[PDB]
Amino acid sequence: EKFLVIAGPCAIESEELLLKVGEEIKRLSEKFKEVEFVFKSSFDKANRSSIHSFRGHGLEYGVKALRKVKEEFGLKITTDIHESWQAEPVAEVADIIQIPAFLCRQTDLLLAAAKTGRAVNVKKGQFLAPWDTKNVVEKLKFGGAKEIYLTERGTTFGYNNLVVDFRSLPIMKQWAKVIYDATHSVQLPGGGMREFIFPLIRAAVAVGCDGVFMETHPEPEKALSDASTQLPLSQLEGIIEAILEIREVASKYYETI
Amino acid sequence: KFLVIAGPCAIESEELLLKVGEEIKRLSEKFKEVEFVFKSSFDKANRSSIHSFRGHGLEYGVKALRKVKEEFGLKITTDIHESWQAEPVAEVADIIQIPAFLCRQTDLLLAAAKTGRAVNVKKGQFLAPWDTKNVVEKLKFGGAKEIYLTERGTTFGYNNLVVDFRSLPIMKQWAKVIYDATHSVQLPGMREFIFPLIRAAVAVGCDGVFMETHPEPEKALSDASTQLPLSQLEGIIEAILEIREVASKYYETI
Amino acid sequence: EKFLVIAGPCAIESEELLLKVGEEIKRLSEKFKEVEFVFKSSFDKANRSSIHSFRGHGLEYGVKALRKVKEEFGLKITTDIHESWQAEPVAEVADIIQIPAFLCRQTDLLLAAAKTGRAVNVKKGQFLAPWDTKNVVEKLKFGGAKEIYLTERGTTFGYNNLVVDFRSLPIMKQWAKVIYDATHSVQLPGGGMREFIFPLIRAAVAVGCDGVFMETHPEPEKALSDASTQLPLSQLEGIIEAILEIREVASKYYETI
Amino acid sequence: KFLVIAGPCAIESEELLLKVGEEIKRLSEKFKEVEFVFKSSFDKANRSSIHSFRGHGLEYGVKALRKVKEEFGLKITTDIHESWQAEPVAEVADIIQIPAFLCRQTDLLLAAAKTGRAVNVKKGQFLAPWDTKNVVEKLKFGGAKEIYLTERGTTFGYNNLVVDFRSLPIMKQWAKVIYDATHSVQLPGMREFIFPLIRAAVAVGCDGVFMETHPEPEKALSDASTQLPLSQLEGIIEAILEIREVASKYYETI
Numbered sequence A, C: 001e002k003f004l005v006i007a008g009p010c011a012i013e014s015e016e017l018l019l020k021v022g023e024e025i026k027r028l029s030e031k032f033k034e035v036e037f038v039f040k041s042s043f044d045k046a047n048r049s050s051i052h053s054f055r056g057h058g059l060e061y062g063v064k065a066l067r068k069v070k071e072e073f074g075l076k077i078t079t080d081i082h083e084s085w086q087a088e089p090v091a092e093v094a095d096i097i098q099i100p101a102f103l104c105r106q107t108d109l110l111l112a113a114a115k116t117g118r119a120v121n122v123k124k125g126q127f128l129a130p131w132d133t134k135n136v137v138e139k140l141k142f143g144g145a146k147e148i149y150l151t152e153r154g155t156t157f158g159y160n161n162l163v164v165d166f167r168s169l170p171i172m173k174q175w176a177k178v179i180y181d182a183t184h185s186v187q188l189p190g191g192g193m194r195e196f197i198f199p200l201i202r203a204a205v206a207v208g209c210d211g212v213f214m215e216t217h218p219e220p221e222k223a224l225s226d227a228s229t230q231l232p233l234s235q236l237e238g239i240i241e242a243i244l245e246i247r248e249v250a251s252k253y254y255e256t257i
Numbered sequence B, D: 001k002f003l004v005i006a007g008p009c010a011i012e013s014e015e016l017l018l019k020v021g022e023e024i025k026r027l028s029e030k031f032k033e034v035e036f037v038f039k040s041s042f043d044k045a046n047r048s049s050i051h052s053f054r055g056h057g058l059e060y061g062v063k064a065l066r067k068v069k070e071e072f073g074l075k076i077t078t079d080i081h082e083s084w085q086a087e088p089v090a091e092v093a094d095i096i097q098i099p100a101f102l103c104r105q106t107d108l109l110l111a112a113a114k115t116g117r118a119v120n121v122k123k124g125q126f127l128a129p130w131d132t133k134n135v136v137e138k139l140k141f142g143g144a145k146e147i148y149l150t151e152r153g154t155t156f157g158y159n160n161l162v163v164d165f166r167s168l169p170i171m172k173q174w175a176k177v178i179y180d181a182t183h184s185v186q187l188p189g190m191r192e193f194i195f196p197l198i199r200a201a202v203a204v205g206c207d208g209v210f211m212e213t214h215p216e217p218e219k220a221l222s223d224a225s226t227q228l229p230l231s232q233l234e235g236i237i238e239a240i241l242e243i244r245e246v247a248s249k250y251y252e253t254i
């Protein structure tokens, strides 16, 4: 099955930033033809820790910018919603509607996403056990979703720290396609360690998943969000090549569900 | 005055609310040194299963809660799940409650603060005590004046919550602190631990306790394993006041 | 039942230090006649993080110093053992033999302590669940122990942090008398916060336990071990008075096992 | 060379050790790029229950292990529990193993280091990765030259262990790192997770893997639910080498 690579800048800082990243993602999609690329960027960071942190330029601006990316590069699009009313307008451009980790149990949000007919990707809450994602998928199927993904992004481990329990990959695979979030899984909540992004992503593909999620920015140090975890854009190609190589050699050993 | 927030988990029917409201009204008359607030959710918007009880809708719920306030003169509190619900709920709710999973949703907090009502935020199971400072800052920025933070346990491995009582004195630095005695006891919960931990909370020091109570928990449509039998509420409240009276002498300053 | 207060300097820095603390504990035992005091101090810190940290002056010196405390003040004694061979000589002076938290599963150490005929107090390992202490007590009874205590001292919560799950008190009470370690439960492993010692001890007595364990030193800042958690000796009396008051008012509500 | 430490959890009988030793000897001949070390405990000194299998004693165990080394020419490793056992065990053990619960017992570490043998310390379930630096310092101070640190999971709530793979690159700063594939999967363990996590370990990068294996795990007197069937060992080793060959290109420097 075609491996999925979901990547893009954390927040839609500007349509210009999006087009710059989209250009590189498009180039990579032409090289790695065995990969299905999906361009990601949030029109709103609705859960920042501080009221003073950057959120975005609004849903309208964001959807317009994402539509530009899709129009100019022919790339699939994904973005997250925060309240039910956003599902409809976002579905006009998003191929995959993303459900934030803190909101993975909000029934109406999941239902709003599911009735759009678009694929839905739920980030597993830091509080949720792997086996409890079964009910999340059930809610989506109930709501009409036919293409469902579950994303591993770490679990609360003491205060201001997340651990990745890789046993979650084969467990969640029982009911949905599984994505590994390589950048948020190493973040330190309300404190991330970029030095662990690559080794953990190698672990994810060796264990076996259906795709990886990576936030990338031309200059992470200047990012308006997740400046400590976003991967420099120039490093994306090398990481993807490594992903595919490890996936290939490990693939014959992936257990059947 | 010490705050006691209590009532059935979900608004199973205004009838149920009236029966519980009657008992809470009685206790309110018996314990004048306590500020009672009637609580019940018009919607369980985050159930694990799609086939579980959610409720009868916001309108029916606000109506039922309105009936309790008018018939008993009790303050009211219920939780909201999306920003648009703040305004209509604020018509009856003296305290707007923010769900634990939603304690970081900026718009929900601002929407509640904008109503002019008091706001009680359930501390997320993923949040560290010191990180609630930013939560309070959002509400203040939103115009909130009366702010509460509720301790309801922290993720401890899978399907288990632990109460780190160090959080009480830490959160008290920036807001009044309430201890949720019913949801905090989640085991892979267990009613036998409710009273013991409530005693711990008041010995440590808090500004109030939150307790879900139902006439027949066994028949509750939500949190049946943790809702306190109505008949046991008076005894626990009296125990709370006695321990607090003695322990309060040792509560650390700010 | 007579409440137990186990207190003393963490390590036997000197026989002089022991006599100074013992003098104060003796004075308090004369005031709080409803309390059973047990003087504690380790002849060896056999598990320090660093090879360069203070350990002690040897078993011989330690037992001799403890015997002096008992002889001069008529106080019961408790100290911990680290290897089986130490049980016999330590039992010559110790009324209660303490089993370190990391060693709560070492069968031979528990058995060595149990056959001495002395009471045995096992510190619950930071890795052990409350319900799994049942087998620890079973091992001791099997080995001949007739007076057994289990001490709550925190549980691993992420890295370098311990949390106290107070549900452990009523759970462990099912099979042994329960002691709350007020000073080690707030320590930050390999990093304690002294500001939380008092509030958590208030919690322990409100929930209900059979005693409390508190390391105390005339000048904690100069202690050779646990300098960040040992309680100043001058504060001991006030803390004990508070303990008894809260215990009394909460006592009628203690659940039956 | 990549290290593979394997054998039955407990020395149920020298017969069992010979049967496993024969297979490990064969694999040793098949995979020349791998350094094999036969492992088995002469005593399970930390069983939860007093009524569980411990073993046949140190003398019988050292004798049985001696037989494996002499009949197959394989290196040996076993764990010690008290300081006095180091000397007699060092007569046969090329690597002295320190139990996880005992990784902070200074005298045990020094006793092992004093034998002149290599020392492998199982990282306590309570220890943070960075805190193993002090463990290595004790062994060096004790004269140890060849030192290993083994990842075997970390306490995650109750009756559950999680493997934080960030520990591999962190511990590598001060010692060779081994991944314990069998004990690391403790669930409220589960054999279905052994292979998946072993693959993760080699993709991340380690210096060896530790695997308990038994001809008939179902009949094992210890770790029956987690011991790898002997017949599956070859396949896993080959998988390990293939993934390592490809992934090693990306292992971070020191």
Ligand SMILES: O=P(O)(O)CNC[C@@H](O)[C@@H](O)[C@H](O)[C@H](O)COP(=O)(O)O
Binding pocket: A010, A045, A047, A048, A049, A050, A053, A099, A100, A101, A102, A123, A153, A184, A187, A189, A190, A226
């Ligand atoms: O829903 P999630 O899986 O967290 C994913 N997406 C949103 C993230 O970009 C965001 O929540 C991320 O975890 C951020 O690291 C938190 O933000 P802050 O720096 O204000 O403390």
Ligand SMILES: O=P(O)(O)CNC[C@@H](O)[C@@H](O)[C@H](O)[C@H](O)COP(=O)(O)O
Binding pocket: B009, B044, B046, B047, B048, B049, B052, B098, B099, B100, B101, B122, B152, B183, B222, B223
């Ligand atoms: O925000 P909170 O503190 O959880 C409070 N409000 C909602 C709770 O009453 C309750 O529904 C909670 O989610 C409970 O964890 C039990 O629900 P479920 O049966 O779906 O597994």
Ligand SMILES: O=P(O)(O)CNC[C@@H](O)[C@@H](O)[C@H](O)[C@H](O)COP(=O)(O)O
Binding pocket: C010, C045, C047, C048, C049, C050, C053, C099, C100, C101, C102, C123, C153, C184, C187, C189, C190, C226
């Ligand atoms: O067995 P325990 O419950 O830990 C109890 N008694 C021994 C303690 O004094 C000691 O282990 C204590 O936890 C110390 O805080 C650890 O020492 P270091 O500062 O070297 O990192």
Ligand SMILES: O=P(O)(O)CNC[C@@H](O)[C@@H](O)[C@H](O)[C@H](O)COP(=O)(O)O
Binding pocket: D009, D044, D046, D047, D048, D049, D052, D098, D099, D100, D101, D122, D152, D183, D222, D223
């Ligand atoms: O120090 P360690 O890494 O645990 C290794 N040595 C011992 C293990 O083989 C094993 O006995 C371990 O304690 C296991 O956790 C299972 O044992 P039990 O059946 O008593 O609950």
